[PDB]
Amino acid sequence: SLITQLCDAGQLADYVGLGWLNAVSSQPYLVQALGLQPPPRRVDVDAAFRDAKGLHGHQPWVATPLPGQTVRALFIGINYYGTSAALSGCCNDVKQMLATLQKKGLPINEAVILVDEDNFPGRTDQPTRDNIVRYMAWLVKDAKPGDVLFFHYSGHGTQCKSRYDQCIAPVDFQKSGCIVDDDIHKLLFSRLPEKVRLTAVFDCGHSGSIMDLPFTYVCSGGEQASGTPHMKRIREGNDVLGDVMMISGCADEQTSAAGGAATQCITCMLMNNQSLSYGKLLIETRDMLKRKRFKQVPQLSASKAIDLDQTFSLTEMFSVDRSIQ
Ligand SMILES: [Sm+3]
Question: Is Repeat among this UniProt entry's keywords?
Answer without folding.
Answer: no
